[PDB]
Design a protein around this motif. Structure first.
Motif, short mmCIF file in Angstrom:
data_model
loop_
_atom_site.label_atom_id
_atom_site.label_comp_id
_atom_site.label_asym_id
_atom_site.label_seq_id
_atom_site.Cartn_x
_atom_site.Cartn_y
_atom_site.Cartn_z
N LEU A 105 1.02 -1.24 0.08
CA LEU A 105 -0.03 0.05 -0.15
C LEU A 105 0.91 1.15 -0.04
N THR A 106 0.47 2.29 -0.70
CA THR A 106 1.11 3.63 -0.89
C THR A 106 0.35 4.89 -0.90
N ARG A 107 -0.90 4.48 -0.56
CA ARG A 107 -1.83 5.85 -0.39
C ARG A 107 -2.78 5.77 0.87
N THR A 108 -3.63 4.68 0.91
CA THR A 108 -4.53 4.68 1.95
C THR A 108 -3.71 4.52 3.43
N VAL A 109 -2.51 4.20 3.53
CA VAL A 109 -1.75 4.16 4.87
C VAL A 109 -0.85 5.00 4.93
N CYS A 110 -0.95 6.36 4.22
CA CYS A 110 -0.01 7.69 4.33
C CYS A 110 -0.86 8.67 5.35
N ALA A 111 0.12 9.43 5.63
CA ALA A 111 -0.24 10.67 6.65
C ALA A 111 -0.06 12.09 6.06
N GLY A 112 -0.32 13.34 6.65
CA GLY A 112 -0.20 14.41 6.06
C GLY A 112 -1.22 14.65 5.11
N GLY A 113 -1.94 13.60 4.46
CA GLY A 113 -2.84 13.33 3.41
C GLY A 113 -2.18 13.08 1.99
N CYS A 114 -1.03 13.61 1.97
CA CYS A 114 -0.29 13.29 0.79
C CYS A 114 -0.50 11.99 0.06
#
Ligand SMILES: *[C@@H]1O[C@H](CO)[C@@H](O[C@@H]2O[C@H](CO)[C@@H](O[C@@H]3O[C@H](CO)[C@@H](O)[C@H](O)[C@@H]3O)[C@H](O)[C@H]2NC(C)=O)[C@H](O)[C@H]1NC(C)=O
Ligand SMILES: *[C@@H]1O[C@H](CO)[C@@H](O)[C@H](O)[C@H]1NC(C)=O
Lengths: 121, 506
Positions: free
Chosen positions: B182-191
């Motif tokens: 995963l590289t979207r749903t598990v990000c922070a800052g919202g980036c």
């Protein structure tokens, strides 16, 4: 880089201290919070502290769990007294500010974060 | 590294015998696919060891009616879905199995982590597992509007569950290596994309599908364009403007936008524009131009009347040249579009009241010297032994190819030879000559000299055997240099062994 420490197998009614350590940062003007996910149960926000030290808890933890952000060492602590087997799960710390999308517990589980709690009787 | 795609869809190949060969030619050594990656009507035996280099598909990935079990698209990071299957899906996987059992079993798209536009449609294929195990919305981009997903689990086997090492039990395969990152749903800052949980681990705003570091050099894929290893939002314009007067002066930093990569100059058979682009159809209120050394460009234009072929203007929906519309090519020395000759052409249709097409009406094309799109012939008058009406045709650009692969298509024709004496090049795409009973003088044409990029070749089968041609005395006249000729006699030679005599050689 935030890491969780303080997990272990313990008999119920004992105590554990949880440490939310960082490698950089400042938690100033960014209220922190501990979360926990029990096996096959929903992610829950157990406790959270403000930038000013105004603490919050859930109904199952109040009077047993005390949360506290050290400024100097720059580490968030969670003291868990009066442990019950209903507590057991994995506890993840994470800024309520920098909140994820797939879910706090679920995302931090992906990156291999949080520390394990085990409680028998 | 960069290669053209296809545009066949569910349409069925006429030469299954060469179908695989075309794909190998198309996708061998190719890292980025311009347009669609269509993989269709493949057998079980089939080796697809060429698809292993594929990394990006600006089009839509289609895997339909395939009895193969493995489709090695491991390195595929991103599908931009610029074009969509049924205008709704960026990845379509349809009917792969049914009459060791046959069909696709794993998708193993372990590197797919980006679908900028378009959804996912998986249906009708029994052997397939790990289709509902994948969290599709993490691969789906943030701003992606078409986030639709219709998937069918209906199967006829047991799915050995994901490795315990696969976080969330989300995997493309039982293997430890086929766990969905995963590289979207598990990000922070919202980036949009990240390589870790914290915002300091967010990928640069100009990355897509993930990254290895913060800066714009680190992107797994560029969201917009690739500026020599950096991912800019636009490429550097060719024009700078005087601060005071606005006099357009060309800047040396300027780069044309080809696909999703900034380039010093365009690739061959592609048009350079004043707008700083590489393209195949020229913008509106624009005319095509040739340069000192043949380099085709695109100048703004009062704009001259020109001859439209099929797939342009009103002839966008027209199926093929017919008696009703054959008259338009009168005097045309160049058709802007495709020429497609079909059975329905010469047979005509009484339901529309479009009469048959007589062989004398083809005389019109005596004028015609270049075709921007492609020449397709699955019909002809048995009256005519060869292609004489196109003896004038100097070049087929193939900017529009038939089914997205073939410049020149000749199938199911009762004709003795070709006779395209003038045909000196094929701009882009492959030559499909097959199931032409009587065709000789095929191996006599030096097709190695009509092609321009290595992804090209001729694919022939079910013709007349050359063994028979030589035996029936059908070979190149002795005044055709290195016996390169288009047909019988000195009226067909490529380079004459001795001096000209107009039409004939002497
Ligand atoms: C975007 O286009 C560039 C075109 O250069 C692709 O090539 C990449 O180029 C950079 C340097 O500009 C490579 O980084 C380093 O290059 C040096 C040589 O100058 C090399 O010795 C180092 O080991 C290092 O690789 C980069 O690796 C290279 N990548 C290739 C050739 O695949 C770039 O990959 C394209 N795509 C993206 C998304 O950047
Ligand atoms: C190709 O398919 C046939 C189907 O009968 C099979 O016998 C053969 O083993 C296949 N080739 C290989 C190398 O497995």
């Amino acid at each position: 880089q935030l890491q969780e420490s303080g997990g272990g197998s313990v008999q119920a009614g004992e105590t554990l201290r949880l440490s939310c350590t960082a490698s950089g940062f400042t938690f100033d003007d960014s209220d922190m919070g501990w979360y926990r996910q029990a096996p096959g149960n929903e992610c829950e926000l157990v406790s959270s502290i403000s930038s000013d030290g105004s603490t919050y808890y859930a109904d199952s933890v109040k009077g047993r769990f005390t949360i506290s952000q050290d400024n100097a060492k720059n580490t968030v602590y969670l003291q868990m007294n009066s442990l019950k087997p209903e507590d057991t799960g994995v506890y993840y710390c994470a800024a309520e500010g920098h909140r994820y999308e797939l879910g706090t517990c679920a995302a931090l589980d992906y990156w291999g974060r949080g520390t394990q709690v085990t409680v028998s009787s | 590294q960069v290669c053209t795609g296809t545009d066949m869809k569910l349409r069925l190949p006429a030469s299954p015998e060469t179908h695989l060969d075309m794909l190998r030619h198309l996708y061998q050594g190719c890292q980025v696919v311009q347009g669609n990656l269509e993989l269709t009507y493949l057998p079980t035996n089939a080796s697809l060891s060429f698809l292993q280099d594929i990394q990006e598909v600006q089009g839509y990935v289609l895997i339909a009616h395939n009895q193969v079990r493995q489709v090695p698209l491991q390195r595929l990071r991103i599908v931009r879905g610029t074009q969509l299957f049924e205008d709704n899906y960026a990845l379509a996987v349809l009917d792969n199995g049914d009459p060791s059992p046959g069909g696709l079993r794993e998708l193993q798209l372990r590197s797919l982590t980006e679908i900028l536009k378009g959804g996912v449609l998986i249906q009708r294929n029994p052997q397939l597992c790990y289709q509902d195990t994948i969290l599709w919305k993490d691969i789906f981009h943030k701003n992606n509007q078409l986030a639709l997903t219709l998937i069918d689990t209906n199967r006829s086997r047991a799915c050995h569950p994901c490795s315990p090492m696969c976080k969330g039990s989300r995997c493309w395969g039982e293997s430890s290596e086929d766990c969905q990152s995963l590289t979207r749903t598990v990000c922070a800052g919202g980036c949009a994309r990240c390589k870790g949980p914290l915002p300091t681990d967010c990928c640069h705003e100009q990355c897509a599908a993930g990254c290895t570091g913060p800066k714009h050099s680190d992107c797994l894929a560029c969201l917009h364009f690739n500026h020599s290893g950096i991912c800019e939002l636009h490429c550097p314009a060719l024009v700078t403007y005087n601060t005071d007067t606005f006099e357009s002066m060309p800047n040396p930093e300027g780069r044309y936008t080809f696909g999703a990569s900034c380039v010093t100059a365009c690739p061959y058979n592609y048009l350079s524009t004043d707008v700083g682009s590489c393209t195949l159809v020229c913008p509106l209120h624009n005319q095509e131009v040739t340069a000192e050394d043949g380099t085709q460009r695109c100048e703004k234009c009062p704009c001259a009347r020109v001859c439209y072929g099929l797939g342009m203007e009103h002839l966008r929906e027209v199926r093929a040249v017919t008696s009703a519309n054959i008259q338009e090519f009168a005097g045309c020395k160049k058709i802007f579009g495709s020429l497609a000759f079909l059975p329905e052409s010469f047979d005509g249709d009484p339901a529309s009241n479009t009469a048959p097409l007589q062989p004398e009406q083809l005389q019109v094309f005596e004028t015609l010297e270049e075709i921007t799109g492609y020449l397709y012939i699955s019909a002809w008058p048995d009256s005519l032994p060869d292609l004489s009406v196109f003896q004038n045709l100097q070049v087929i650009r193939g900017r529009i190819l038939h089914n997205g692969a073939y410049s020149l298509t000749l199938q199911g024709l009762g004709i003795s030879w070709l006779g395209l004496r003038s045909l000196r090049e094929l701009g882009s795409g492959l030559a499909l000559i097959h199931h032409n009973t009587h065709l000789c003088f095929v191996h006599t044409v030096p097709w190695d000299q009509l092609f321009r990029n290595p992804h090209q070749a001729l694919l022939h089968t079910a013709n007349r055997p050359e063994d028979e041609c030589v035996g029936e005395g059908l070979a190149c006249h002795q005044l055709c240099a290195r016996g390169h000729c288009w047909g019988p006699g000195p009226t067909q030679c490529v380079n004459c062994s001795q001096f000209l005599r107009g039409q004939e050689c002497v």
